[PDB]
Each structure stands twice: as structure tokens, then as C-alpha cells.
Amino acid sequence: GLPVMTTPGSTQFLTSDDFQSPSAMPQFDVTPEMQIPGRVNNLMEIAEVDSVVPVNNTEDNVSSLKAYQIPVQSNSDNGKQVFGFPLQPGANNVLNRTLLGEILNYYTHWSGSIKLTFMFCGSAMATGKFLLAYSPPGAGVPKNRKDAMLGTHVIWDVGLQSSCVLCVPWISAAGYVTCWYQTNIVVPADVQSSCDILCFVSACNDFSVRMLKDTPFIR
Amino acid sequence: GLPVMTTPGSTQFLTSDDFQSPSAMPQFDVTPEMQIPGRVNNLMEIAEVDSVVPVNNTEDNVSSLKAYQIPVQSNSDNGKQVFGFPLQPGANNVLNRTLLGEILNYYTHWSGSIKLTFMFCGSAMATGKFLLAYSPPGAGVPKNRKDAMLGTHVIWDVGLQSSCVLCVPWISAAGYVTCWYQTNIVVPADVQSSCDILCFVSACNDFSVRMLKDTPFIR
Amino acid sequence: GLPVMTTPGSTQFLTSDDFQSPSAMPQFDVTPEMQIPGRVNNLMEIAEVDSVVPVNNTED
Amino acid sequence: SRSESSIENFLCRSACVYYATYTNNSKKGFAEWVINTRQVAQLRRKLELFTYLRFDLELTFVITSAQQPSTASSVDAPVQTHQIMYVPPGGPVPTKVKDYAWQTSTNPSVFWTEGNAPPRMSIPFISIGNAYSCFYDGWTVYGINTLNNMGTLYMRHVNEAGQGPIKSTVRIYFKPKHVKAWVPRPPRLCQYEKQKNVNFSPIGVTTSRTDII
Amino acid sequence: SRSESSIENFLCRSACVYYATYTNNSKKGFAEWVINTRQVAQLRRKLELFTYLRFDLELTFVITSAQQPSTASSVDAPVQTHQIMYVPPGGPVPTKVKDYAWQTSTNPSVFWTEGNAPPRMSIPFISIGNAYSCFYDGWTVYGINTLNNMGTLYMRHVNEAGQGPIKSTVRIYFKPKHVKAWVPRPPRLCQYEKQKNVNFSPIGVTTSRTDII
Amino acid sequence: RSITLGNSTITTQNVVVGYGVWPEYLDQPTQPDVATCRFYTLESVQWMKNSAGWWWKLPDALSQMGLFGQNMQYHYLGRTGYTIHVQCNASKFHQGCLLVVCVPEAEMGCSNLNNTPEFSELSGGDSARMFTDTQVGESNAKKVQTAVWNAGMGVGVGNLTIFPHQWINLRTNNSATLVMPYINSVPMDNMFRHNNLTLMIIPFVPLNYSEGSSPYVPITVTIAPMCAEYNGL
Amino acid sequence: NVLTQSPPIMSASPGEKVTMTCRASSSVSSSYLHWYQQKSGASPKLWIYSTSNLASGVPARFSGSGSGTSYSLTISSVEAEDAATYYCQQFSGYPLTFGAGTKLELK
């Protein structure tokens, strides 16, 4: 017949191949398609949406809806820390179980930038100001309001707008996203002073993942 | 199906083949290139550079930097040998561990020509003359300055230039590269008389190697 | 894959075949030719020359 | 590098889903596996990121053998042959090793002799609805959805026992092909209890730390 | 003749790099090899003529077998099957013969039955930096460079032990393919002590002679 | 003659450039180019009679050096080319010969055969480390083996001419000049854990002089960074 | 790397030739083997360096030899004033080990 010659690696099962296969059920006349809404072509479209960050863990709020709420009250000392969390990946941080951080646990190397949106869910009559400090990797965490101001920051006037966006990069000291009281919460009579803040996280649309592995969130 | 017919030498592993192979990791999206300087396309570019020849072995200079230096002093007898070394390959010669001779030990047959550069690292006020004799394969080693002059040679005036080039062929009595005092080293007052010479070797750009084997410099 | 079907006389060694063979030494860069005089293309050129006949055997 | 995060590169990966043994002379040795995606917990968590899936199917069987301890006197065996029968949804089902439903003409089976390449077979999108459904909020028993039924597989020897027992294991490999996915969904936080359902026991949202600052 | 001295003709040659044994019933028999170029001293001295290398990888496994001394009564065995699992850099690693990490879906493995052509597989340039680095003057421990990590390979039988022990050896062959090289470097004069590092003890420059003339 | 960079000025009268290529520029890396681009003259070493050699690890000798050292603690990453001016100044009555060679990725070897050297021993910051012409013993734990005929890397020291180099022969020459491009596998690396160049100066022919002349000769190294840029915001 | 000298005690009349040897455990290079001489109640003195070269101020009756792992020292004519102890030093790695000592008494 036609002379052929079989090479090494012939009658083997390599589990990561792509070969044609004999169909078990021919002549079946498979069901046609249908336009169902909401098609996913890529996993980066799942990561681009906003998700609430459980930034208030504290070992008794994790089995509650209190894990998402940052307490803000009108204290008596000017200049204090509201919250603060590092950007160190994987070692039990707070962006881990979120909807962005569930995709980045399926890969080993990823690198890009992050939107962080904060929303002040207090009264409509309450006013104040906040600092939103970001420390770059290498610079230490600020210990005063003053040297937090000397770095990069956003001053967030609550009475003007109720939402402030801060975009940082996140790569696989690595960073800090602390936030500070600039002024107190001034409130009228017959309005409550204990207000809360919610924090949303997203993907800033321009980044990449390599070398898929399996997630550490399993037995 | 299609009638085929397998020939002898089919399901064998010949270690020197070139066959297509099934990739273990597809869909990986390999890292792209990058312009790194200093690309090697051939091993003859490694051989074309100049390297110092340890021409002063003498069984106690080999664990030193003295192995590279040829002693030159102002003696009292006119006509003497400075150095001399055969061009017989492999049998413990001095061009063996050099950067040219490390490539020619990976092959069995090689044949071409050799640049040999000498450099007089003495004072700027010292003068003299040297003969640079080359004996061809078949002719004996010269035993006088006179019959060394009657062959092929270069007279190297040190006071004019401090570098003299001599090009010989080297094929896998086979040759000699002896060198002789023509005149003494004339030196002024308050200048040292013990000067040294360094010797560089290279490839003269036009030669070929065949039948790669493994080097004898291993356990 | 592509469906094939092996016929009789497949994995045999017939000593008078002509098949392609995998080279043991590739990348060797074989020595080129050279014009040597006196090439033989056929054995009938050996037979066309004259040779002396031992026609006087006689056992001694 | 955004081609590693596509839907095909995320889900078209091979995975061992089942592992069963069967011996030829013991009259209750034959394997059986109802094809479901909820078998291995790592693949299940990936397919449950989407509500509706649609894919072809490709299965490969790694069948090995072992010689069981017989009595004596020179057990010699020829090469063994196995049968891997695939029952479509709504087909007759065997219940013994010598049964009629092995011989039915609508259940396609492969026959494979030991010592060759493993027996791959391929199954198209076999359903009446236009997509497989991972979640189903309703009754047919709550949350079953009898429309995404993919069939069953059955394994046995075809040689009679000659002199000594021989038991064999099988590992089934699973590979979704040409995947389309719709309506993304948040990934599971709690652990998996039972295969059939979504039942769970509550757990905290995330691992905790000592102070907020 | 200058095509024998090219970089591809110098380095794209096959070389046996590893040799390990493993037996099926002894519960501590399975092979393991972390892929490094510093295994055999003759290939290492050739790859250390250059600072940065970049190549594809091609591996071939010559697996044989041997019948260990069993007790008695007619050991008969079917054809054996082995599994060769490749763990990428940063993957889960087995530690026993019955472990979960053999069954993971991201570690591609080949299954090969004895008596066929040997099991070749091919591995691309798997790194994040743009070149493998033979030398690294820095810390991550001094001079390690965790970026040129190529993975690990693991071998085992897949058949259970039937009547008698069987031990198997494996020889791994190594062939760089489509090689690019940068920044040449002088060849080593001293001998090799440890695999990890460049540590040495000093030796003379060359072999000596009696007199200079 | 009398070239200047920023607020410094050195003077020169033969240059050898790298692997043939000239250094040039490339989240987003920012370009600081005027503030630290100047000539950083390190202190002089003394070439005596029985001297053996010197070395400097190159993105570490400029770590305590002024605003260049301030730009390193503020930045995680960076990529930099260099320009090295080496001159020694002796009379016409001295004699010697130096090899000025610039080695990329020079792994040193420890004296103990199991361990690895330490950071205080591998590189003195803006200060020259010395080769020796004896052996460093095996008894001390973490020290660099500096047998100069092996150049600390286990190799023939005569074959060090394959790196970009220059000879300084006192009879004919006075200085050397090197222009070294950025050589690395990654395009931008950790600058705190990697010393990607090493500048070695080895006297092949030793210094000699008659009685009366100055008994040692100074050597002066000057480094000027070319096309430096870092990563951060 | 230890050195054994033999014989430990050596006696010979003046005017004859006598020799001693110093055999190393491993290979020592020919340039790193030296010979010393220590009289009774005095410091040692360097006698022969690098196995063949006489030191300064030493008489010409001595000549060292040997290579590899076996080295020796020969006295062509024995006088009366050169009765002392002779040690051999080596260097293969650190430390620098000495011999055991060979004592020469005249007869």
C-alpha cells in the first residue's frame, strides 16, 4: 500500500490535545440555536462590574451584612483614620473573595489597575470632608493626616457629591488605601450622626492574566 | 479505509531525528521577544576575538597571573631565545585552553590560519629589537639567530611601535613560533630594565570545523 | 483522525525493497565531489577491453 | 494576554470525573455512570459561573487490568476486550451482566482490545432545550429539570472467565468542546454537600482581621 | 563547512538527563524530576557559554520494565500502563502514589501502554521573562532567579498490583529546539561541585611544561 | 575636551561601545533625565607593586551617591545604561598594563563549597573590593573566593576579553572608555536585588618603577548614567 | 593532607651520602613543597624552597627532588655542623601542614 512510518509519541493519550473524534450519535439532527440574552465571550467582562468590598471584617461582622459598612461618627479629635487596608495580594486581604478577586485566583500572573468607588450612605443634611490617601509600593503607611496629605490623595467633600473614585494599580510593602477625617461630620438638630460608607471595586478594563491554575477556595 | 503499509524502522526512537511533536501546553500565549544586545548566530564569532596565551607555564606560574608574561631583560650575550612554542595540536600545547582552542576541542577536523599579536608592556623609554621566527612544518627548529633569520621572520623594533602581528596557519614537526633577541634592551638612567611581553591569539576569520564531538576537558 | 487501513505485507522486511530511511547523522555537511579520472558507469565497459587467453594450460 | 481568559480556554480542559472497577466472573461486576457535571467539585464550580451552557462532549477511557489471585496451575490469558455502551436519554438500561439491553441496536457501543490506543468517543449537544441549564428554579421534585439529561455509560468484559479472575478499572476523562455560555453568576462561597442540589450551611463572608485600620 | 558551527547545530542535540526507578506495590515508588539544565555536566558546559538562552523543549521517555521476585504460582501479567504528569511552574505537587494532585485538570499528562512507540511530548518557552538566564547575580537566597522555572515531571504505574511486584526504569531525553542565544561568555576551566551554584575551588590556568623555550 | 553634565565638568582628549549598540530609552515609566545625569567620580584606588585587582558592582556603587541614591529609594524599578571613564595617571618612567573589562551577570563564588556569599562581601558601596593573589580558605563561611587567575567566577582570566573591554598600556595609552547598554532578560527589573554589571580592573603586567619614582599610581573611575528611567507614580 | 617522614632517626658517619623522604597523602604541587632545618635550641631556617631551589647562604651539598606524592632530600657529603632536624612543608589547601621530623645524628 502507501508506505507509512509511525513516529514516537503515536499511540498515547496526551490530555491536552485537539484531535478529530468519531461521533457516537450521528444522524441525530441536533436542536438549533436560540437568542438568549447576556452572552459571555470572555472572563474579563465578569471582572469589569462593581462589587462591594467587605472592608470591615473585625472577626464578628463576617457573618453579617455589617462587614460591608464602614462606621463614620462625629468624634471630638480632628484628624483620625477611618479605615485602611493593604494591597498585598492573597495573604488574606479584603479584595480576595470579591467578584474581581475570584477570577484572579484562577491564574498565576496578572497585572493591571483597579477602580475603587466609595459611596456615602449617610443623611442628606450631613456634611464633612475626607482624605483618600494612597501609598505607593515602597513608601510606608502614613501615621498622621499631615504626611498623608503630602503624598497623593483626593479630598472628598461629602456635602457636594456622595461618590468619589480613586484608581490605583494592583500587581501580582505593596500599597495602602488608608482614609482620614479632614473635618468632622456637621449635622443639624434631629438628624442622626452615625453614618456609613460602602466601597466598590472593579477592574479598570486594561489587563491580562496568564497560566491558568485551580483556585485555593476548595477542600 | 485508506490502505497504508508500514515500513521497517517505523516505531523506533532514533535520537537524531526531526519530527513534529504534540505540544503539552497549548493555549498558553507565550511571552514575546525582546531586543537584548549581543546575539550569537555562530560559534566562529566567539573564536574571532583576541585572548591572552599562557606561554610561560613553567610548573609554578600556572596558578598565577605570571603565566601570561614573558620575561625580557637586558643580558650580556647578543643573540638568545626569548621564548618558543610548537604548533603541535592537543598534546598539551599552550593554545589549548584559550578561547579559540576551547571551540576547536568540540570538533574533530578543523583547518585554517591564526593571528598572533604580541604587545610590549615595558617602559616608554626602552628600545630594542626582536626577531619573530616561524618554522614551517618539516623544517627544524632554528638553533641560532642566524639561521632563524634565513627563514621567514619579522624584525620588531620596539621603540617605533609596541605591537607586532604574525599570521601562521594551523591544521589539525608541525611548526614553531620561536622569538629571538636581535639587539639588547637599551634603557636610560632611573628606568627599570625587566620588561614583559603579552601574546594574543585569534582566528584569522576564514576556517571551518567538522564532526562535532565532546570536549576532553571533563572528568 | 484520518482513517487508514493497513494491508497484508506491512510490517515486514523484504530485503529487496527501496524505501526512504531516517538518517542517523543529519547536520553533518558531507564532503563534496571531486573529478577523479576513469569513471565506470556500466560493467560492459570492463568487458570491452582485450585480455590474454591462457590457451596453453597443459597441467604444468 | 487576553486569549487565556476566553470561555473556550477556561472550560475546554480535560478532567477525570469517574473511577470504577469491575470483575468478570463475580456476576455483579459492571460499571455505570450517569453523565452529570456535578461529579468533581473543581469543575462544577467553574461550570456554575454561568446559567446556561451549550457544548459538545468528548470522552476518553483509560482501561487497565490486574490479575486476581486464582487457585493454581498456569493461568494463561489472551488479550482482553471490553464493551463501553452509551445509553441515550430515554433508552433501555441493563441490570445484569447477561441482559438483553446490551444487545439493543440503538445504544451505540465501542469494543476495544487491550494494548491499543484508548477508546475515544464523542457526543453532540443531546437535548431538546436550546441550552443545558446549571440551575433550575422549579419542579419537573424541586430543581431537577429532566430536559438536561445526557445519558449513561456502562462497561463490561466480553470474554468469558477462562481460568482465573481478572478485575479492571476505568477512568473517564471529560472535555467540553465548542462552549457557549450565557448569563454570568457569582461564584460559590459555601462548600458542597450533596450532588443533586444547592443545599448548604451558612458561613462567613470572608476571612477576618483584628482591626479595621 | 560553517553550518556545523551554528547555534542550532551546536545545541539541538539529544541527551539523557535523568534515570530513576519506581515500583508499583511499594507505596513509595514514583519518579520525580525538577526540570533544570544543570543535571549532566557535559550539556551544562555548553549551555553556559551564553548568558541568556531561549528555546522550546522536547522530551522523550524510554520506559522499560522488569519482573521482581514474587512468591509462586504462575504470575501472569497484562500489558502495563504508565502516567507521566507534567506540573507547570506554580502547580500542585504530589507527595504519595494515591494523591489528589495526579487528578488535577491543569497538569497535562500522557498515558502510554507498554509495547508501543515511546511517549514524546513538547513544552514551549514557559517563562515570564523574555529569556532563560544561565547566570543571575542577585537575590530572589543568592543567585537563584525564580523566573526561569520550567516545571516538574512525575511518573507512576496506573495498574494495581495483581500477583507479583514489577519495577520500572525511565530515561528522559532532552532536546533544545529553535535556540536563540545572547551575550557569549568564557568556558569553564574549573570542575563542577554542586548543581545549584557556581562554587568551585581554584586550579591552575593550564597544564605546564618544563622550560619556556 | 571638557565635557559637562549638569553641575560637573571633566576633561578628556578612542571609545569602545558595548555590543555595538548605543543606549536609548524605551504601567507607564516616567523619564527623569536632567536631575541625576552627571559624572559620579568615585574615590581613587592605589596601584601598588603586588596589587591584584579591583571590582565594582555597577547599579550599587551609585546607591549612596547623592540624588541618584535618593531616586532609588523612591522607585521600585528602573533600567539604565552607563558610560565609564577609567584613567590612571603615571609618568613615562613607570610601566605596567591593565585590563578594564565590564562583565554582565557576574556570579561570584563562595569560599565554602556549600554556602553563598553575603551582601557586605560581594559589593562595597562606592568602594572597591580587592582580588587577592592567594587563596581564600574554606574555613570561613560566607566570603568570596578571590583567586585572581580564576577571576572569582571559576574561569580562565585570560579569556575575559570576550566581554566589552579595553587595555591600558602605560607605554602607549593613558585611559579607557566604555559605553554599556542595558542588558537584561526582563525589560525592567528589581533594582534592589540585582547587580547586572560588574566593572573589573586587573593588572596583567605588574607595576614597576625605579628607585626614586612615586611608589604607587592612582586610578580614577567616573561613571555617568545614560537613559535612566523608573516605574511609578 | 598529612606528611610522613621516614626514617625518624637517622645515623651516619661524616663523609658519606644519606637521604630522607617525605611522602604526602595526596598530590602536592612541586612548587609548594619546602624544607626547613631546626637545630637544638634554635629557631628553624628555610633550607630549600619549591623542592629544588637552594635558599640563601646554604651550602651546595644538598639537592632536593621528587614529584607527585613522593619527595626526597639528598646530602652528597655529610659534615659535622649540619646535624639537626629537617621538616617538610606543603600546601594543597589550608592549613599548611608540616612533617613529623627527621633527626640526623652523626656517627
TrEMBL record, chain C:
Location in the cell: Host cytoplasmic vesicle membrane; Host nucleus; Virion
Organism domain of life: Viruses
Biological function: RNA-directed RNA polymerase: Replicates the viral genomic RNA on the surface of intracellular membranes. May form linear arrays of subunits that propagate along a strong head-to-tail interaction called interface-I. Covalently attaches UMP to a tyrosine of VPg, which is used to prime RNA synthesis. The positive stranded RNA genome is first replicated at virus induced membranous vesicles, creating a dsRNA genomic replication form. This dsRNA is then used as template to synthesize positive stranded RNA genomes. ss(+)RNA genomes are either translated, replicated or encapsidated. Protein 2B: Plays an essential role in the virus replication cycle by acting as a viroporin. Creates a pore in the host reticulum endoplasmic and as a consequence releases Ca2+ in the cytoplasm of infected cell. In turn, high levels of cytoplasmic calcium may trigger membrane trafficking and transport of viral ER-associated proteins to viroplasms, sites of viral genome replication.
Family: Belongs to the picornaviruses polyprotein family.
Assembly information from the UniProt record: Homodimer. Interacts with host GBF1. Interacts (via GOLD domain) with host ACBD3 (via GOLD domain); this interaction allows the formation of a viral protein 3A/ACBD3 heterotetramer with a 2:2 stoichiometry, which will stimulate the recruitment of host PI4KB in order to synthesize PI4P at the viral RNA replication sites.
Protein name as it appears in the record: Genome polyprotein
Organism: Coxsackievirus B1
UniProtKB/TrEMBL annotation, chains D, E:
Superkingdom per UniProt: Viruses
Domain Picornavirus capsid residues, every copy: 1-148
Keyword Cell wall biogenesis/degradation part of the UniProt annotation: no
Ranges in a coiled coil: none
Keyword vocabulary terms for this entry: Capsid protein, Host-virus interaction, Viral attachment to host cell, Virion, Virus entry into host cell
One BP annotation, GO: virion attachment to host cell
Subcellular localization: Host cell; Virion
Molecular function terms, GO-annotated: structural molecule activity
Regions that span the bilayer: none
GO cellular component: host cell; viral capsid
Keyword Chloroplast included in the entry's annotation: no
Protein name: Genome polyprotein
Native source species: Coxsackievirus B1
Range of the intact protein held here: 58 to 276 of 278
Automatic annotation (TrEMBL), chain F:
Domain of life of the source: Viruses
Location of the protein in the cell: Host cytoplasmic vesicle membrane; Host nucleus; Virion
Family per similarity comment: Belongs to the picornaviruses polyprotein family.
Subunit note: Homodimer. Interacts with host GBF1. Interacts (via GOLD domain) with host ACBD3 (via GOLD domain); this interaction allows the formation of a viral protein 3A/ACBD3 heterotetramer with a 2:2 stoichiometry, which will stimulate the recruitment of host PI4KB in order to synthesize PI4P at the viral RNA replication sites. homodimer.
Task performed by this protein: Plays an essential role in the virus replication cycle by acting as a viroporin. Creates a pore in the host endoplasmic reticulum and as a consequence releases Ca2+ in the cytoplasm of infected cell. In turn, high levels of cytoplasmic calcium may trigger membrane trafficking and transport of viral ER-associated proteins to viroplasms, sites of viral genome replication. Capsid protein VP0: Component of immature procapsids, which is cleaved into capsid proteins VP4 and VP2 after maturation. Allows the capsid to remain inactive before the maturation step.
Protein name, entry field: Genome polyprotein
Organism: Coxsackievirus B1
